[PDB]
């Protein structure tokens, strides 16, 4: 699934 | 080849606009009897240095005053010892303070030969020249009454108009005093600080 | 009793002067120029900006060829500009920074400079060693130099704060004539197109006409309420204009010995710094303390245009001998060339 | 005596400035008007020259 | 749908305000030559870097978080990731540049006359932009769409960033949060601290000192959350994502971007010398 995030 | 000359000239004119920026320029005002030449401790001109900051004074031996509209500070010198010309100095100080070209130059005000004022008051006819000195009420207490009255008259001219654009820095000086260079240095530090606050968007 | 008798005789003579002028006052310039056509809107723009000075520009003068000009700044540089390319042809270090005037000799061989130093310094441009040098320093005024103008490579006329004007022989370094009769400081000077006469304007609001050969005041003119800062001959040599702290300009004709015109508008409220005429003398160009320069129709007295583009006082102004450009200098440290 | 000496000159000078011969201002005015018309076409500020002829672009 | 509806309202508002504020500061500071001072050179640079930050961070973090997959191409994931770090980096050194310039002018007024010039300001501007474009170069390199599939059997992606091993990942995230947030915030706490101390050593002075305190507070509130989260993920990417992924990190990101909304307010619009510049910039 959609997890984590870009850094900014 | 002509443009290589123009750029080599524009490089030496920028190297000179820096040697200029390193120095603070001051104008002296006052009548004779003031001791202007004794406030000095190092168009006539003279140079001195305090805490590695370099200063350059200039005095001319309503028109020529326009040249000095960008100096850091006017040094205005008054003789405190006799009151026959005190009003003359007050009219002169008023004329400097309200000048169209000087609306942003702060004045360092030297009330000079204050020891001769102390001798004159300890021996003075002051209330005959200024009737509103009667029952003034703020060293000897009488000398302090005169000194503060004398000072009060100039600083009330200096505050009757000015809008906080420029301020007056009053001092009492004897001809024997060495500290005038430190006083000018501190007041230049304060004048430069006051404009740095408005230019650095703090106020 | 002799002091009083003269004083009454001077009052009677002064009254005669007024009657002779009034009798001569048959029509105003604006009654004569009523039917003509207006200079239209003088739309004009900056063609060049000269960026080298680092303090207030105080004065500028064109060379006789409409390329070269000299300019003076209170950074202590006198700079010679090729206005077509903007190249700095030369930069001269002045011995004192407090300069107020600069001039170009008609030959292009020399420039002159002075101010709060009470000296006029002459600089030789055309040396064999390739560096500009001091030719002579003219000492003898007891108050600051407000203006200077060479008649030829050996003769120059000067104005001063000591209320005089003087004519110098540059080779000997001596005054050939002193001109005396102003009571205020003399602020400006202008030599007639034939160089036989000059006019000077002073802080007592007088303008005076002088004979260069005979050393005499021929005529005195009055009308401004306040100190005259600037003066300029009209191109024909029969008239001149003045500008003052009055916030007006005046025009006089020498032969009628009186004011023909005054240039003002109630929105203009500050002093005039400088004046000059176009090649026809149909336009009077004036610099102001409000940072503008205004273009006046010298004959209809209408405000014809504005040279807006400086961030401080327009300190000096000049039209070229070709009539092709106006230079303006300023207290922000740039010159601009216009039209 | 300096005030009386000076005043005699201030009188002489007014004697010279009165001895002059003045013309009517209508004539003086008409000459400045006639001069500007005779020199009108030769003045690039009152009417701009084309960009080919203009030395400053 | 309430949390998504609030999230689009918040992001679109803060975007519109940060575009409007920075573009007005850019406009009024380019038109008014009078307003060209050492400080206003840094404010113009800052407003441009904040405008980039607004345009390249805000919508490109919102849209994938709404759609729950990265809709744009690999070139867009690369290009945005470069400009995000670049604009975030230039801003944090333009805010440390304004604090150290202000400190020289106010605490050493004579000594700073030697160097504090419009040319010196432009040296520091040029060096800051070039060093930001330089160090952010890993972002368009190692940021590539990572695939998965949705419950509708649609193919889906998530733009991500990954140095070649976990030690490089952790050391990198430690470097950026100690050179684009920590020290940039301790030098703005000691600069505005010393300025407040010397200035206080009176109603105008207290109006200045409260702004200096508000500046060091708003910096730590906007940036501490996002810089600490990134460090958490670089250690336990699993726990960080289980906690913060989806809606929570979007608000930590909005809080970060709100810096580019407040900077025009506190540096420009609060001083009429510029407010009048605004009145002089437009008919």
Author numbering:
A (entry chain P): 1 to 8
B (entry chain A): 18 to 59, 207 to 225, 232 to 254, 265 to 303, 306 to 320, 330 to 394
C (entry chain B): 2 to 340
D (entry chain G): 6 to 62
E (entry chain R): 38 to 238, 305 to 386
Copy the relevant paper text:
Those residues were exchanged between CCK1R and CCK2R. Unlike CCK1R(Y140A), which was cholesterol insensitive, but exhibited increased binding affinity and reduced calcium responsiveness relative to WT CCK1R in a normal membrane environment, the CCK1R(sterol 7M) construct was cholesterol insensitive, but displayed CCK-8 binding affinity (top row) and CCK-8-stimulated intracellular calcium responses (bottom row) equivalent to WT CCK1R in a normal membrane environment. These structures required stabilization of the receptor complex through use of a guanine nucleotide-insensitive G protein analogue, with further stabilization of the bound heterotrimer by scFv16 that spans the αN helix of the chimeric Gα subunit and Gβ. Under these conditions, there were no substantial structural differences between these constructs and when compared with WT CCK1R (approximately 0.7 Å Cα RMSD for receptor residues for both CCK1R(Y140A) and CCK1R(sterol 7M) compared to CCK1R), other than the presence of the specific mutant residues that could underlie the observed functional dissimilarities.
Type 1 cholecystokinin receptor (CCK1R) agonist actions are affected by increased membrane cholesterol, enhancing ligand binding and reducing calcium signaling, while agonist actions of the closely related CCK2R are not. Indeed, an unbiased approach, utilizing systematic domain exchange within chimeric CCK1R/CCK2R constructs to identify the region of CCK1R responsible for its cholesterol sensitivity, demonstrated that a cholesterol-association (CRAC) motif ((L/V)-X1-5-Y-X1-5-(R/K)) in transmembrane segment 3 (TM3) of CCK1R was responsible for the functional impact of changes in cholesterol levels. In summary, CCK1R is sensitive to elevated membrane cholesterol, disrupting its normal stimulus-response coupling primarily by stabilizing Gq/11 interaction leading to a reduced CCK-8 dissociation rate, higher apparent binding affinity, and lower potency for intracellular calcium signaling. These distinctions in receptor function are dependent upon differential cholesterol interaction with a specific CRAC motif in TM3 located in proximity to intracellular loop 2 of the receptor, a region that is known to be important in G protein activation.
